[PDB]
Automatic annotation (TrEMBL), chain C:
The UniProt record lists the keyword Coiled coil: yes
Organism, scientific name: Thermus thermophilus (strain ATCC 27634 / DSM 579 / HB8)
Keywords assigned: Calcium, Coiled coil, Metal-binding
Domain of life, source organism: Bacteria
Binding site for Ca(2+): E37
Protein name: V-type ATP synthase, subunit (VAPC-THERM)
GO molecular function, one term: metal ion binding
Length: 470, 127, 40, 41, 578, 385, 312
C-alpha cells in the first residue's frame, strides 16, 4: 500500500527512514530494494523526524536511492488453529514442511497478557515422563516450570526428544477420571544447528509423536530477532490450545542460553548499557515474562507445563542465566558429566536435583501412597552409598562393616539399574517396583523413612523382576 | 497402523491446497479481465479517491497514461496534479507533498493483503 | 501388510478425487465472493 | 580453606573492578555519541 | 491539567512535548489508551515519562495527560478482606470485568464507590478540627473504622451529615473554608505519615511461639528479619504469626514471588480461622500480591504501599503486623529500575542508594502517639532470601545493620522434624534488656535469670559437641551426660511447638515461665543426686520426665494446677531416690 | 546453493590416535581447537593437512606468522599424497594474510577460503578447511568497529560477532550437489583466547555451534607431552553416529574397547582427587593398578610424536591393537592382584616396555608385533599361575 | 640486561658441525632503547666498549627523561637500518630492543588521547597489529646471504604472563625465554626457567648433520624428568620427604642437581658439546629403563659416564 522512500542512513543492522511518523512502535515492516528482493524488519524507535528500523538478516544490497519501506502489521501477531498439530514452522510462523499454510481461527499478539494471580489454582496432578529418576524422585506436576541444567557435551537433546516422545497423563490413577483428556506437546528450538535439526525431525517423524506436536525450529544462522520471537510464539500457541480447547500442553524450550545470547546481542545493537557481566538489566523481567506463562487456571480444564533446557556456560551455577532461572522456576534437574562418561544414559544425578512441587502431585489418589517415603529412602541410601564408595578407596573393603558393604553394593546396583534405563519407557508402577527391588537389598529395619505397612506390603521382591528384562 | 491415516490426511491437505491455489488463479484471471471491460473507470476512480483520502497532504497523482483522462475529474476536484508512469495496472498511486512518502492502491496488492483473511472464509464456502 | 497400505492409498486417492469434484461444484461462487470482497 | 577463600574473594574484587571500569567507558562513549548527534547532526 | 502530545517513543520511555508546568514524579496517562507512567526528567518544554506496561502500538502525536499528583494510595473503608497488586488495584474486580488476563489500561478504584456504610457522626457544627482527629465511625466487619481528617487539614466544622447510609464519596463534613471531607483521602506512598512522638520499646510483641517470645523477643514496634530456606516451614511460621500474634491488623506483602507460591498464599488464607472470633482470618488482613511477570514499578512500590496502609491503620489506634516476603526480589526490581536509568552500580550491581531505601522502609516501624493522642504501633518482619543462602549479600548485609532481631530459620532442624526449625546459635535479639522491666512487672520478677540459665544450659550442651562427635556419647561420664540429657529435654519439651495442635499452637508467657521453672528444678535436683552418688540411668527413668514432657499439651487455664502438681512431684520423686 | 543436506555417517580420519578414537569428527562435521600460545594448534592443523583422507585441503592462514606459510610452501612439494601418490602440494590451496599484512583483509580471507572449499565440494569432492585463527578475524572486526565508533559488547567486540561466526560455521556439511553428486566440507578452526581464558566471548560462541571440541592444556605443553589434549575438557557429538562404520571397517568390538578406555580414564581422574590429598601410597592395590594403567594409557597411547618418522601417522587398526593390548594387560594384572600378587612386582614386568614402544612399529610390521605381544601378555601371567 | 649482553658477546655459528662454508663473519648489533635509565645504559655502553663491539654497532638511544611520544619511532628506525644492512650489504644483524613495555605505554597514551576502544586493561585494540608491524620484520630471504635476528626484552608487570603485553608478544613471536624469580632468589644465574620457555624453530636447526643426532631426544628426556621432579617437589611439601619411595627420591635429587649444575653456569661460555656432556651426566642418574624418550642406540652410545669427571 503506502511506502516510504526517504532513507537517510544505513549502518550495521539499522536504517533510518524520514517522514515515517505513521509507523507504530514495534511494528513489522518490509524492506525492498532495487533488485526486488524483500527483507523483514522491526521498528525500534519512532520520532517526529525519523524512525529507526532494525533489519533482519543482512543489508548487502541496500542503497539510499532505491530502497523502499512498507508496513506489514502494527503489532506482531500469529494465526492459530487446531490444525497446527502435526506441523513445523521456522520460528516466525512460516511453515517449513512444504504443506499449505493454515487458515487461522484468530490472530493473537505473540506477547502475552499476564495471568491474574486470583485466577490461578494449585497444581495437583503429575505427568508420567517415562524416566524413573524423574517420575519417582523429581516428579513433574501439571503446571510446573522444571528446567534441566546441562553442560557442553552432555546429551540434553536426546533427553528432550525422549520426554517429548514418552510423556503422557495417567487418568486411571486419579480415581476413575475421564479416559479422554487431550494431550499435546509444543517444541521450540532456538539457535540449533543443521545436525540437531535433522535429529529432531527424524525422532519426531519415526515414532508418530508428530501427530500430537507443534514444532517451532530456529536455526543458528537465522536472524536473532527470530530467536527472540520463537518462545513467545510457542507459548502463544500453547496458551491458546490449553485455555480454549482444554488441552494438556507440554512446552519444551531447547536452549535458553542461545536465547540469552541473542537477547544480549539485540540489546547491544540498540545502544543499551549492559548490566551484570554484560547481560541486559531487564534480563530477569524478560525471563519472567517467558517462564510465568504456565500454570493451571481455576474454572478451566486445560494446563500448561514448561521444561526449559539450558546449558550452563562453564558448568557454573553462579552464572547469571542459571541463577536467574533458579529464582523463577520450581526446582531443577541437573545432568552429571561423571555418569555420562561412565556410560550411563540418561545421566541424571539425583543428589543435586530437586522438584519443589513434588509433594502435591503424589500420594493417595495419584501414583501410590508409598511414593514419598520410597523416594526419601532412595535419596538417603544413595548418599550413604556414594560416601562409603569414597571411603573404601582408602580404607579398603575388609575394614568396612557389613552394612557399609551392603550400601556400596546398593549404590552400584542403583546406578546400573535405576538411572541407566537406556531408551526404555517405564510406567510409574515399573519404576516403583524397581525401586522396591533395589531397597530389598538393604536389610529390613535399616529403612528408617518408610512406614511398616508399606514394607510389609512391598518389601521382599528380588532384582530379577527387572534384571531378567532390563 | 496410523501411517495410512497420515497418508490420507496429507493427501487431503494437498488437495485442499490445490483447490485454494486454483481458486486464486481463477480470481486473478477475473481481476485482470477488468481492464478490458467498461467497468474499470469506476473502480479506478474509487481507488484513486481512497488513495488520496489516505494521504491528506498528497501533492501529485500518478498512474498509467490510459487512466489519466478519467482521473482528470478528481484532479480538478481535489486540486492535485497528474503525470503518467508505466506503473502497475488496476490501481493508482499518489505522491505526498514532501516527495518522500508514497501510496499505492493496486488491485493485486489488495488481493495479496486480503487473501490471508479471505482464505479462512472461503474454506467454509468450498466445503 | 502391503495390501492394507495399498487399500489406504486407493481410499486416499478416491477421497481426494471426491473432494476435488466437491470443490469444483463451488468454484464459481468462491471466485465471485473473492471478487466481491476485494473490490471497493 | 581460609587462604583459598581469601584468594577467591580477591579475584572476585578484581573482576568486579574491571567490570565497573568497562561500564564507565561505555557510558562515556555513549555520552559522546549522543552529544555529537544532538548538537551537530 | 497539563496536556501534551507524544514526540518520541523508544521502549517504555516516552518523550512528551508541550508539557510545560508538569511536576517531577507526577503520574501521567500516555496515549489514547491512558497507560500510566511517571515523569522522571523535565527539560525545557518537554517531559520524560516512563510507562509501566508495554508501549507497543503507540504512535507519535497521541495525547499525554498529567494528573498532577505523585503515586498515592486511597485510605478509607473497604480495604480489609481485600486483595491488591503492587499499586493498589483490586484484583477481584479486575477479574470480574476482564477475565483471567490483566489487559493493559484497565481502570478500577481501590475502594468500592457503590457499597453503603453506616455513618455515625462524632462532631457538631462550630467545632474546631485539626489533622488526625476523629470525625465519625463506620462498622467494618468486627472493627469500628474511624474516619480521620487528613493530616494537613485544619478549620472549623460548618455542617455534619446525620447518621445514615452513604458511599465513600458523600461529603460528610464541610468546613467553613468550603473544604469537603469524605470518608477517605489519598496519601503519597513515599512520604511517612506524621505522628506526635515515638515511644520506647517497653512492651513486647507476643507471637505465641515459645522460642521467639522467650529467647529472641521483638518489641512492639520493632523490626526482625528471617531467611527463606526451602523446606524450613517459613510459611507455617508466617501464618502462625498472623493467626496468634497480639496484632489487631495484619498486612501481608508479596513483592516478587513465584506464581505458584502466590497461588498457595492466596488460597490458604481464605481458609484460616481467626482464633479470637472464630470467623475468617481474612476479615482483618490486607493482601498485596505480585508475581514476577507483573510490571517492575508495581513490584518496586509494593512495600511502600503496604507500609503506608499499615501506617494508616496505626493512626487509627490499632497495632499492625506487617510481613514483607522476599525483600530480595524487591531489591532485584530496584536494581533493574536503576539499570534502566543508566546509573553507576555499587558492589554486586545494586544502586549505591540501596541501603538508604532499606532504611527508609524499615524505619517507619515503631510505637507512636498518633495525632489524635491515641497509641498505635507497627511491627515489620521482612524475609530475606539470598542467592544461595550466603549472608554476605549486600541486601542481607544492609538489612542486618538496622533490624533489631534476626531469627535464623534452619533447614537442618526441619530435616530432623524439629519445629519451629529455628537455629538458636545463629539468632540474636537486641530487645531483651529493654523489655526486662516489663517482664519483671508482668510475668515474674525472676524470669530474666531463669531465661539466662536456660540459655547457659543450651550453650553448655553446644560446647560438648566436639567430644560427642569424636567419641560415642555413652563413653561420657555422668556430669556431662546429665547436661546432654537436660539439653535434649529442653529441645524436646520447651523449644518445640506443634502449630497444628489444638492447644499447643499458642503458648502464653507464664506457661513458658512454668515450663522453664520445672526444667531448671529437675536439673538442679538431678545435679544434687549425682553429687550424692546415684547412677544416671536411675535418674533417666523417673516419673517426672513424662510430667515435664506433657506440659506442652495442657490447656491454658488448667496449667497452674498441673504446674504446681509437677513442682511438688519434683521434690517427691527425688527424695524417694537416694 | 545445494540440493539437500545429509546426515554424517563417515569419519574424518585425522591420523592422530586421540582425535580419531576418543573424540571423532565426521566427514561433514565441524571442530574447534582452542588453546594458549605454545599449546600446539598449528602443528595439529599441519598434521591434519598432511595425513588426513580428504580429497582437497584448503589452508587459511588468517593473521598468523609468515614463517609457517614458508614452512608449508617449502615442505609440502617434497611430501607424498597419502592416497593419490603424487606430490602433496598438488591437492592443497593456501590463502595467506599474515600478521603485518593489512587488517581489513583478515575478514576477506576466511570468506575466500570457505567459498573455494564450497566450490570444490560442488565438484563432488570431500574438502577439509583449516582456519588458522578466528580470533584474528574477531580482532579485525573489533578494530573496524572502533573506527566506526560503534557501541561494543563484552570485550569491545561488535554485537554481530556471534552471528558472523555461526554463518561461517554453518557452511560445512555433507550435501547432495545441484548436479546430483555428493560432496562434503569439514571445518576445523583454531581459537586463540587472550591469556588462555576460555570464558572469552569468541570461545563461548564457538562452543555453541561446533560438533567436536578439542581443548589444549598449557600444563601438558610445558612438560612436552603432545598432542597435549585436555581429556577432561574435550568432547565429541559424532561418536554415536559413526558406530556402524567402525563396526564394519575396524572391528565389531571397537566401540566396547573405546568405552572401556573411557571408563578407565574417568576412574583414574576420580582417584587422582584422593591421590592429591593423601598420596598414591595410601591407596589400595586395585586403586594403584588403576592409576598405573591410566599413566600407561597417557604415556603410550595418547602420546604421539608429530616429527617421528613412524609415530607421525597412525591407522585405525594400529590404535585398535594398542587398546586391545592395554585392556588385556589390565585384565591379567587385576586377576593377578586378586589372588595376592603384589603390584610393586608387576610394574617391573618386561612386557611393559614392549607395550610402551609398540607405537614406533611400522604400519606393515605391526600385526606380527601385535600377535607376539599378545602371546607374551598371556605368558607373563600364565607362567606365574 | 646481563643475559642480553652475554648472548651478544658469545653468539656464534658452528660451520664445522653443519659442514657449511667455514667462515667467521661477526654479528652486527643494532641496539634500540626505549625509556632506558642511566644505570642500564651505562652498563650496556661499558659492556660494548669492553668487548670492542661498538665499531660494529648502531645505537638508537631514547632515555627515560626523553619525550614519551618519540618511542613510537625508535623501533621502526632501528628495524629500517637493520633491514637495509642485512638485505643490501649481506650482514648478519642482531637486534636488541630494551623494553617493549615502555613502547606499549606510549601506545596506550596515544590511544587514550584519541578515544579508542580499549582491549584489556585499557590498551588500544590495534596493539596486536602495531606490535606485529615491528616483530615480523626479521627473518631470512631466499637468494640473499644476510639475516635479521631479534631479541626483544620486556618486563612482565607483576610477573603475570597473562598481562596483555606478554600475551600478545607470545602470540606474535616465535618462542620466549622466561626468567624465574625463584631461581634468581636462590643465586642461580642465568635464572632461565626451562618449562615456560619455548623455541618454535628448534627442530629446523638441530639433528644429524647440524649439531648432533641425540639433541632432540636428550632435550625431551630432560623436559620430562624435570617436570616429574617438580611434581615430586610439590608432593613432598604435603606428605613429607621421609614418606617418599626410592624412585621419587631419585627424581628429586635429579631436579636439584639439574638446577644447580645445568642452569647455573655463571659468566662462562659453554660449547654445545660441553652442554650435551653435562646433560648426559645428569641423565645418567636415572635408571636406564626410565629414559623412554631416547632410542636405545644413543643410550648405549652415551649413557653411563658420571658427573664427577667434569667437576670434582
Ligand atoms: N511449626 C510447625 N509445627 C508443625 N509442623 C510444622 C511446623 N513447621 C513446619 N512444619 C511441617 O514441616 C513442613 C515444612 O516443610 P515445607 O516445605 O512444607 O514448608 P513450607 O511451610 O511450605 O515452607 P518453605 O517455603 O520454606 O518450604 C510443613 O509443611 C509442616 O508439615
Ligand atoms: N604433536 C607434537 N609433536 C611434537 N611437537 C609438538 C607437537 N605439538 C606441538 N609441538 C610443539 O609445540 C610448539 C608450539 O607450536 P604450535 O603448534 O605452533 O603452537 P600454537 O600454534 O598452539 O602456538 C611447536 O613448536 C612444537 O615444538
Amino acid at each position: 500500500k503506502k511506502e516510504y522512500t526517504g532513507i537517510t542512513y544505513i549502518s550495521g543492522p539499522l536504517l533510518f527512514v524520514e517522514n515515517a511518523k505513521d509507523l507504530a512502535y514495534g511494528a513489522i515492516v518490509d524492506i525492498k530494494d532495487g533488485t526486488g528482493r524483500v527483507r523483514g524488519g522491526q521498528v525500534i524507535e519512532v520520532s517526529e523526524e525519523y524512525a529507526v528500523i532494525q533489519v533482519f538478516e543482512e543489508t548487502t544490497g541496500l542503497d539510499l536511492a532505491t530502497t523502499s519501506v512498507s508496513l506489514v502489521e502494527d503489532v506482531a501477531r500469529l494465526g492459530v488453529s487446531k490444525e497446527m498439530l502435526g506441523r513445523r514452522f521456522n520460528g516466525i510462523g512460516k511453515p517449513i514442511d512444504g504443506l499449505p499454510p493454515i487458515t487461522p481461527e484468530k490472530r493473537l499478539p505473540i506477547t502475552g497478557l499476564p495471568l491474574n494471580p486470583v485466577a490461578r489454582r494449585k497444581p495437583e496432578q503429575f505427568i508420567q515422563t517415562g524416566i524413573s529418576t524423574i517420575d519417582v524422585m523429581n516428579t513433574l506436576v501439571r503446571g510446573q516450570k522444571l528446567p534441566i541444567f546441562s553442560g557442553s557435551g552432555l546429551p540434553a537433546n536426546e533427553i528432550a526428544a525422549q520426554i517429548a516422545r514418552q510423556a503422557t497423563v495417567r487418568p486411571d490413577l486419579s480415581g476413575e477420571g475421564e479416559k479422554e483428556e487431550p494431550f499435546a506437546v509444543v517444541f521450540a528450538a532456538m539457535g540449533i544447528t543443521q545436525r540437531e535439526l535433522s535429529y529432531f525431525i527424524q525422532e519426531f517423524e519415526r515414532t508418530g509423536a508428530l501427530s500430537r506436536s507443534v514444532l517451532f525450529l530456529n536455526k543458528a544462522d537465522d536472524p536473532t530477532i527470530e530467536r527472540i520471537l520463537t518462545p513467545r510464539m510457542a507459548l502463544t500457541v500453547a496458551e491458546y490450545l490449553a485455555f480454549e480447547h482444554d488441552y494438556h500442553v507440554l512446552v519444551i524450550l531447547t536452549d535458553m542460553t542461545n536465547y540469552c545470547e541473542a537477547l544480549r546481542e539485540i540489546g547491544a545493537a540498540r545502544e543499551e548499557i549492559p548490566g551484570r557481566r554484560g547481560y541486559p538489566g531487564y534480563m530477569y523481567t524478560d525471563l519472567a515474562t517467558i517462564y510465568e506463562r504456565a500454570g493451571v487456571v481455576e474454572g478451566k480444564k486445560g494446563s500448561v507445563t514448561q521444561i526449559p533446557i539450558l546449558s550452563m556456560p562453564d558448568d557454573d551455577r553462579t552464572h547469571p542465566i542459571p541463577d536467574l532461572t533458579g529464582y523463577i522456576t520450581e526446582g531443577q534437574i541437573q545432568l552429571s558429566r561423571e555418569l555420562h562418561r561412565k556410560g550411563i544414559y540418561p545421566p541424571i544425578d539425583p543428589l543435586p536435583s530437586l522438584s519443589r512441587l513434588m509433594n502435591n502431585g503424589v500420594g493417595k489418589g495419584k501414583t501410590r501412597e508409598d511414593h514419598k517415603q520410597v523416594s526419601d529412602q532412595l535419596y538417603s541410601a544413595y548418599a550413604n552409598g556414594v560416601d562409603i564408595r569414597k571411603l573404601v578407596a582408602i580404607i579398603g573393603e575388609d575394614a568396612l562393616t557389613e552394612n557399609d558393604r551392603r550400601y556400596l553394593q546398593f549404590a552400584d546396583a542403583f546406578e546400573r539399574f535405576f538411572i541407566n534405563q537406556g531408551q526404555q519407557n517405564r510406567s510409574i508402577e515399573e519404576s516403583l517396583q524397581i525401586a522396591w527391588a533395589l531397597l530389598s537389598m538393604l536389610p529390613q529395619g535399616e529403612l528408617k523413612r518408610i512406614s511398616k505397612d508399606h514394607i510389609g506390603k512391598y518389601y521382599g521382591q528380588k532384582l530379577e523382576e527387572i534384571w531378567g528384562a532390563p | 497402523e496410523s501411517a495410512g491415516e497420515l497418508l490420507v490426511a496429507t493427501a487431503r491437505t494437498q488437495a485442499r491446497g490445490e483447490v485454494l491455489e486454483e481458486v486464486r488463479r481463477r480470481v486473478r484471471e477475473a481481476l485482470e479481465a477488468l481492464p478490458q471491460k467498461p467497468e474499470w473507470p469506476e473502480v479506478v476512480r474509487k481507488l484513486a479517491l481512497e488513495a488520496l483520502e489516505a494521504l491528506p497532504g498528497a501533492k501529485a497523482l500518478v498512474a498509467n497514461p490510459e487512466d489519466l483522462p478519467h482521473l482528470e475529474a478528481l484532479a480538478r476536484e481535489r486540486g492535485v496534479e497528474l503525470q503518467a508512469e508505466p506503473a502497475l495496472r488496476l490501481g493508482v498511486r499518489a505522491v505526498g507533498a514532501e516527495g518522500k512518502t508514497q501510496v499505492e492502491n493496486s488491485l493485486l496488492a489488495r488481493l495479496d493483503r486480503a487473501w490471508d483473511a479471505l482464505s479462512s472464509k472461503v474454506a467454509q464456502a468450498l466445503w | 501388510t502391503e495390501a492394507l497400505l495399498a487399500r489406504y492409498r486407493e481410499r486416499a486417492e478416491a477421497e481426494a478425487k471426491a473432494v476435488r469434484e466437491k470443490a469444483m461444484a463451488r468454484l464459481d461462487e468462491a471466485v465471485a465472493l473473492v471478487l466481491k470482497e476485494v473490490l471497493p | 580453606i581460609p587462604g583459598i577463600r581469601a584468594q577467591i574473594r580477591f579475584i572476585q574484587q578484581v573482576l568486579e573492578q574491571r567490570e565497573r571500569e568497562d561500564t564507565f567507558r561505555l557510558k562515556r562513549i555513549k555520552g559522546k555519541i549522543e552529544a555529537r548527534e544532538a548538537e551537530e547532526e | 491539567m497539563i496536556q501534551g502530545v507524544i514526540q518520541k517513543i523508544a521502549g517504555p520511555a516516552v518523550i512528551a512535548k508541550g508539557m510545560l508546568g508538569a511536576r517531577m514524579y507526577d503520574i501521567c496517562k500516555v496515549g489514547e489508551e491512558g497507560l500510566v507512567g511517571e515523569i522522571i526528567r523535565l527539560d525545557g518544554d518537554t517531559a520524560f515519562v516512563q510507562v509501566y506496561e508495554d508501549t507497543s502500538g503507540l504512535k507519535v502525536g497521541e495525547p499525554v495527560v498529567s494528573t498532577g499528583l505523585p503515586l498515592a494510595v486511597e485510605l478509607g473503608p473497604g480495604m480489609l478482606n481485600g486483595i491488591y497488586d503492587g499499586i493498589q488495584r483490586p484484583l477481584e474486580r479486575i477479574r470480574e470485568k476482564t477475565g483471567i488476563y490483566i489487559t493493559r489500561g484497565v481502570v478500577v478504584h481501590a475502594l468500592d464507590r457503590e457499597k453503603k456504610w453506616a455513618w455515625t457522626p462524632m462532631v457538631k457544627p462550630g467545632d474546631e478540627v485539626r489533622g488526625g482527629m476523629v470525625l465519625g465511625t463506620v462498622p467494618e466487619f468486627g472493627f469500628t473504622h474511624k474516619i480521620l481528617v487528613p493530616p494537613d487539614v485544619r478549620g472549623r466544622v460548618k455542617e455534619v451529615k446525620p447518621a445514615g447510609e452513604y458511599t465513600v464519596e458523600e461529603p460528610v463534613v464541610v468546613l467553613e473554608d468550603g473544604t469537603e471531607l469524605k470518608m477517605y483521602h489519598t496519601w503519597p506512598v513515599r512520604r511517612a505519615r506524621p505522628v506526635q512522638r515515638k515511644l520506647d520499646p517497653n512492651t513486647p510483641f507476643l507471637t505465641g511461639m515459645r522460642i521467639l517470645d522467650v529467647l529472641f523477643p521483638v518489641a512492639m514496634g520493632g523490626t526482625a528479619a528471617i531467611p527463606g530456606p526451602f523446606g524450613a516451614g517459613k510459611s507455617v511460621t508466617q501464618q502462625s504469626l498472623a493467626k496468634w500474634s497480639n496484632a489487631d491488623v495484619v498486612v501481608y506483602v508479596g513483592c516478587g514471588e513465584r506464581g505458584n507460591e502466590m497461588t498457595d498464599v492466596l488460597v490458604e488464607f481464605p481458609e484460616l480461622t481467626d482464633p479470637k472470633t472464630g470467623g475468617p482470618l481474612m476479615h482483618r488482613t490486607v493482601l498485596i500480591a505480585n508475581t514476577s511477570n507483573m510490571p517492575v514499578a508495581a513490584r518496586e512500590a509494593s512495600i511502600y504501599v503496604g507500609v503506608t496502609i499499615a501506617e494508616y491503620f496505626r493512626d487509627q489506634g490499632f497495632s499492625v503486623a506487617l510481613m514483607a516476603d522476599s525483600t530480595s526480589r524487591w531489591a532485584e526490581a530496584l536494581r533493574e529500575i536503576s539499570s534502566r536509568l543508566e546509573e553507576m552500580p555499587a558492589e554486586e550491581g545494586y544502586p549505591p542508594y540501596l541501603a538508604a531505601r532499606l532504611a527508609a522502609f524499615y524505619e517507619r516501624a515503631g510505637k507512636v502517639i498518633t495525632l489524635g493522642g491515641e497509641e498505635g504501633a507497627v511491627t515489620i518482619v521482612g524475609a530475606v532470601s539470598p542467592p544461595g543462602g550466603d549472608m554476605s549479600e549486600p541486601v542481607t548485609q544492609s538489612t542486618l545493620r538496622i533490624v533489631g532481631a534476626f531469627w535464623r530459620l534452619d533447614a537442618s532442624l526441619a530435616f530432623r522434624r524439629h519445629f519451629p526449625a529455628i537455629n538458636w546459635n545463629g539468632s540474636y535479639s537486641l530487645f531483651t534488656s529493654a523489655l526486662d522491666p516489663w517482664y519483671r512487672e508482668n510475668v515474674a520478677e525472676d524470669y530474666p535469670e531463669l531465661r539466662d540459665a536456660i540459655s547457659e544450659l543450651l550453650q553448655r550442651e553446644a560446647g560438648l559437641q566436639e567430644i560427642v562427635q569424636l567419641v560415642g556419647p555413652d563413653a561420657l561420664q555422668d556430669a556431662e551426660r546429665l547436661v546432654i540429657e537436660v539439653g535434649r529435654i529442653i529441645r524436646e519439651d520447651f523449644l518445640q511447638q506443634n502449630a497444628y495442635h489444638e492447644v499447643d499452637a499458642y503458648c502464653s508467657m507464664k506457661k513458658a515461665y512454668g515450663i522453664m521453672k520445672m526444667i531448671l528444678a529437675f536439673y538442679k535436683e538431678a545435679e544434687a543426686a549425682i553429687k550424692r552418688g546415684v547412677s544416671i540411668d536411675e535418674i533417666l527413668q523417673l516419673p517426672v520426665l513424662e510430667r515435664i514432657g506433657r506440659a506442652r499439651y495442657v490447656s491454658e487455664e488448667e496449667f497452674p494446677a498441673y504446674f504446681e502438681e509437677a513442682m511438688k512431684e519434683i521434690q517427691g520423686a527425688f527424695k524417694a531416690l537416694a
